[PDB]
Structure formats: C-alpha cells, structure tokens
Point group: D2
Chain length 182, copies 4
C-alpha cells in the first residue's frame, strides 16, 4: 500500500481546499492510503539568524520527517493574489533548508480550488517553478483546478459531493498512484 | 518633495538586501526622502478566521498606513527557491485584504540582490504577476538585479560601496521619481 | 477622440478572438475609435541577418507606424501551449528591434479567449513579462479572459453577443480609455 | 549509443547558441552521439486553416520524425524579450498539433546563452511551462545559462573554448545521458 500525505495551503476552519484534502482519503484507489500532514499554522517566519542560533523548528522537522516517510505528497492549496499563499511558501522555505531536503526526488501532486472560475491555475505554475529548484518529481497531466468550489461541497460534512469533481479527483489520484510507481 | 519607503524581504540582521535598502537614502534624487517601513517579522501568518474574529493585526494596519502616506514604495527583497520569500508574500496577502487596499494605484519599484550571478531575477517576475492583482503601478525600466552583492558592500557600514552599483541604483531612483507622475 | 488599434494573435478566418476584436468598435466609449492593425500573417520569422542585410520588412514598418499613431493598443490573442502564440511573439520580436521602439511607453490592453474555462489566462502573464522589456504601459484591471467563447458568439455576424461578455468588454475599454492619461 | 539531437532557437549565421550546439557533439560522453536537427527557418507561421486545407508542412513532419527517432532532445536557444523566441515557439506550436505529438514523454534538456549576465534564464522558465503541457520529460538540475557568451567562444571555429563553460556543458550532458536512461 502506497502512503500518500496532504499538505494544506489554507489555515481557515472552513477551508474549501481543506474539504478537498479530507475527501481524498475516502476516494483513493484501493492500493493507496492518504493521511493529513500536520498543520503549518505554528511555523514561524523564516529567518537565517534563527536557523543558526536556534536550529530548526520542531514543527518543521516533524513535517519534514513525515514527508520523507511518505511515498507521495499532494499539495492542496488555494491561490492568493495570483500566486502561492505566503504561509505555504514560508513552510516550503524552511523545508528547503534542511539536511536531506525532504522534497528532493519526491513525487508531488498539485491540487488547487477557488471560488473563481479559473480555480487557482495561476498558483500552480508558480509552484511548479518552485518545486523544480527543490527537485521534486511533479506529475504533468492530469491537472486539477476546482473552479466555483463552493457549489460542489457539503458544509456539514466538510467534503466534496459534486459527482463530476469526485471522478476527476479519483482519476488524478489513480494517475498519481501509477506515477509513484517509479 | 517626494516620500518614498522601503519594504524589506529578508529578516536576518546581516541582510545584504537590507544593506541595499539602507543605502538608498543618500543616493536618491534631491526631491526624494527615502525612509524604511516597519519590519514584517511580527506579522502573523494569514488566516481568514483571525481577520474575522480579531480584525486586522495592528502591525498590518501600521504598515498599511505608512504605505498610504508614501508617494511610492520600493520593494527590496531576496529570491527564495526561485520565487518570492514566504514572509514578504504573507505580508502582502494581509495588505491585500484591507478595505482601502493600500497598494491599489500605488507606484512600486522592485529591486533584488543575491549571492549569485542571477541577482534574484526570477523572484522579480513572480512578484510582478502578484502586483497585478493588488493593482499597483509597477515601473518597468531600469531594473535592478544585484548579482553577487557580497563582493560590493562594506560590512562595517552595512551599505553598498561598488560605484557601478551605486550609480545604477541612483539612476533607478531618479527614474522612479519621474514615474510618480 | 482617442485612437485605439487591435493586434490579433490568431490567423484562421474563423478566429473567435478575431470576433472579439471586431466587436470592440461598437461597444467602446464615445471618446474612442477602435480600428484593426494589419494581419501579422505576412511577417517573416525574425533573423538578425535579414535585419542587417535587407533592413526591416515593409510589413513590420507599416505595423509599427500604425502603433506609433495610436493612443493605445489592445492585444487580442488566444493561448497556444500554455503561452503566447508563436506568430504574435515573432511579430513582437521584430517590433522590439526598431530604433524608435513603437511599444516603448505605449499603453496596452490585453484580452484573450479560449474554448476552455481558463480563457487564455496563462498566456496573459507570460505576455505581461514580455511587455516589461518592451517598456509598455500595461493596464491592470479589469482583466478579460473569455472562457468558452464559442457559446457566446454569433457565427453569421462573427461578433460577440453574450450580454455579460459585452458589458465586461465595454467596462474594460471604458477603463482603458481613462488609463491613457 | 544514445542518440541526442539539437533544436536551434536562433536563425542567424553567427549565432552564439549555434556555436554551443555545434560544440556539444565534440564533448559528449562516449556513450552519447549528438546531431543537429534541421533548421526551423522555413517553417511557416501556424494557421489552423492551413493545417486543415494543406495538411502539415513537410519541414514540420521531417523535424518531427527525427525527434521521435532520437532518445533525447537538447533545445539550445537565446532569450528574446524575456521569453521564448517567436520562431522557436512557432515551430513548437506546429509540433504540438501532430498525431503522436513528438515531444510527449520525450527527455528534454534546456540550454540558453546570452551576451548578458543572466544568460537567458527568463526564457527557460517560460519554456518549461510550455513543455509541461506537451508532456515532455524535462531534467531538473543541473541547469546551463551561458552569460556573456561572446567572451567564451572562438569566432573562426564557431565553437566554445572557455574551459569553465566546456566542463559545465560536459557535466550537464553526462547528467542528461544518465537521465535518458529511463
Ligand atoms: C489573501 C487572499 C488573496 C486572494 N487572492 C486570490 C487570487 O489571486 N485568485 C483566486 O482565485 N482567489 C483568490 N482569493 C479568493 C480565494 O480563492 C477564496 O477566499 C478561497 O475560498 C480560499 O481558499 P480556502 O477556502 O481553502 O480558505 C484570495 C483570498 C485571500 C485570503
Ligand atoms: C530559503 C532560502 C532559499 C534560497 N533560494 C535562492 C534562490 O532560489 N535563488 C537565489 O538566487 N538565491 C537563493 N538563496 C541565496 C540568497 O540569495 C542569499 O542567502 C541572500 O544573500 C539572502 O538575501 P539577504 O542577504 O538580504 O538575507 C536562498 C536563501 C534562503 C534563505
Ligand atoms: C497550437 C495550438 C495550441 C493550443 N493550446 C492551448 C492552450 O495551451 N490553452 C488553451 O486554453 N487553449 C489552447 N488551444 C485551443 C484554443 O484556445 C482554441 O483553438 C481557440 O478557439 C483558438 O483561438 P482563435 O479562435 O482566435 O483561433 C490551442 C490551439 C492551437 C491552434
Ligand atoms: C528580438 C530580440 C530580443 C532580445 N531580447 C533579449 C532578452 O530579453 N534577454 C536577453 O538576455 N537578451 C536579449 N537579446 C540579446 C541576445 O541575447 C543576443 O542578440 C544573442 O547574442 C542572440 O542569440 P544568438 O547569438 O544565438 O543569435 C535580444 C535579441 C533579439 C534578436
Ligand atoms: Ca484558523
Ligand atoms: Ca540567417
């Protein structure tokens, strides 16, 4: 069984991308198991001085060890001002500074959702440029951009229910599972 | 006289970009007064729940008001992992949610420095894409990419000394001053 | 009254973006006259040897002069392979080499359409990066990405009909008109 | 012996990138053979109407068949206005429309050179975004950006002679050769 984890790019309780991430474990192919990674909320802003005098934040090393243990990582994130959320980017800046950089050679799947029609596509291309330097193995197609995400979820359960969205989500995961087999 | 402020993208005290930023005051045109904005170090990670429950952070409000009063903003920052540093971007995310969005229509000048020959060039274009949604007035030329800034600064004073760099910057500021109108 | 011209990025006769372009004349503000520039179809591939030996192509010179006379340029184009179409970009490469570079300081408005929901959004930001080196004055908002334009046009007239799209465009032009100053 | 070919992004006789491309065959690892692809100069501007009424240009199909035959492709190109040269992009637009798109799943190496200090880096990131849609297998590091390329070549021979540039060029090719073994 492949072990895939999710890195969440939004910090709000009712996050839509948060709902997409929690739905993935329930629709993953039988040969895949998905779990959520710890939240990035308590990670402090990156400062070279702290890295030297304090060492690495426990939260950063905990997140890093779980990524190394996993066979694949799915980054589920919204788009902020046509790009990557500062919080998520900051968690990536810390990670990129670690011994045995956790994402190098690591299979990565990208997922974004927005209330807008474009569904976070802009965020995705900047993210790939970032992951290139970190040497992650990013899967090309299929891509997933959840537009008008609010009309495809269930507020109570906090999950995706729109049939169309569920099939594409399941399709991509399957492709990612086959991708990981490398 | 024009009032210009600097937004710093690095937090370490030995910051080379910080050196660039603190050098701008004495090489700017005689019609410009360059001062620094507060550090983005205390600005907490963006969370809509916080915006709703607590309102906007006081540090964010302070940063914003200084931006509103300025005639222009010079963003001085390094490039982290082929893009914009997490901290700087997070501060921008916060500012972008403000009712009277501070950077809307605000003239902006970009400058980056790095220990490598590319001088933070990649970071600049991602930052330009981001600035479109904030609706800022970003100047085109001349651009400034400080390649290997470590060889052209003076540690004792923490300012730039390489005459070539100094004239480049001065030319850019002079150009930014004309841009304001 | 302002003179605005359109640079078309697609060459096929059934071009949806072409439909957008030819619709702009009757939805523009009363202070703007929108006309089309010549097609980029005859512009040959850029080659410095040709620039040196033959000089600039007459078609390139013609395109340039019309750009110089206009108060603004609206670039209407599709998105090919997640970026700017080869032909359009090649025409820009030619213009960029001209002594009195036509687009320098020229206000530019970008609009794209596609048969998909993204509406050529990716192409727009690459094009914005390119326009920095040409030193153009590119407007920020509102932006226009015509998603699935095929469902909102009228083949018999070859113009846009979807009222929502029409008002969006009109609003953009009105905004571009104010931008010129 | 792996068969690698070069796609040239500049059309001028004295092209510096042209010199870099011609030097590659002479410094490739013993397990690799490099050849130049036909020139893109005579390829007409892409027009959907021509594709339908005329079919594909012979030059486009000749270039496409040679790419399919090769084990790897090195794109050597300059940077025009912070991006990909229109001519090269146009040759890619035609290619992307072919049956059995020639670059899908094809190993690709990127090389750029400029008279400027940045050496065509801007062109490279836009190109990768393009190759992602075409589903090419693009190698991450090492990257090659030849800055101030004019002071590293020999006008007469039309080749690179700067020792430093030659070593990196040889290093990348070796990495690409090992990369191709996939
Ligand atoms: C700082 C900030 C910037 C935003 N900018 C964008 C943007 O550039 N593109 C976009 O599609 N949506 C943007 N939005 C709207 C988000 O898509 C929307 O708030 C979304 O539902 C947030 O993701 P979440 O629900 O998982 O918290 C922005 C939201 C925030 C908080
Ligand atoms: C998290 C992190 C990521 C880095 N990644 C890059 C990069 O992608 N490109 C680059 O040119 N330099 C990179 N560097 C090197 C910086 O350019 C160099 O540390 C610089 O001197 C930092 O800016 P400062 O001196 O103002 O603190 C990185 C540094 C850090 C801390
Ligand atoms: C070479 C080529 C590449 C294409 N690639 C893309 C793409 O990357 N993104 C997209 O949204 N549409 C793409 N399409 C579909 C176009 O959006 C669609 O054909 C469009 O209607 C063309 O613009 P036009 O109608 O003005 O000729 C491509 C079309 C062609 C001819
Ligand atoms: C249309 C055009 C646009 C140019 N724009 C850029 C640019 O954006 N970045 C850059 O580094 N060099 C630029 N240059 C300078 C080239 O790097 C230089 O002419 C180079 O030596 C061309 O590649 P080649 O020698 O193989 O023909 C431009 C050249 C041309 C012909
Ligand atoms: Ca929260
Ligand atoms: Ca030639």
């Amino acid at each position: 069984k492949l072990q895939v984890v999710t890195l969440l790019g939004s910090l709000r309780k009712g996050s839509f991308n948060g709902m997409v991430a929690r739905t993935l474990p329930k629709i993953a192919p039988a040969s895949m198991e998905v779990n959520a990674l710890p939240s990035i909320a308590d990670i402090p802003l990156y400062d070279a001085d702290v890295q030297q005098e304090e060492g690495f934040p426990a939260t950063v090393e905990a997140l890093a060890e779980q990524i190394r243990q996993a066979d694949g990582v799915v980054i589920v994130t919204p788009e902020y001002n046509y790009s990557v959320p500062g919080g998520l980017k900051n968690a990536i800046d810390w990670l990129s500074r670690l011994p045995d950089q956790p994402l190098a050679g690591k299979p990565v799947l990208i997922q974004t959702s927005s209330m807008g029609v474009i569904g976070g596509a802009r965020c995705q291309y900047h993210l790939r440029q970032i992951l290139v330097f970190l040497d992650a193995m990013v899967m090309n197609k299929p891509e997933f951009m959840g537009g008008v995400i609010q009309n495809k979820v269930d507020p109570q359960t906090g999950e995706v229910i729109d049939q169309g969205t569920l099939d594409h989500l399941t399709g991509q995961l399957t492709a990612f599972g086959e991708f990981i087999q490398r």
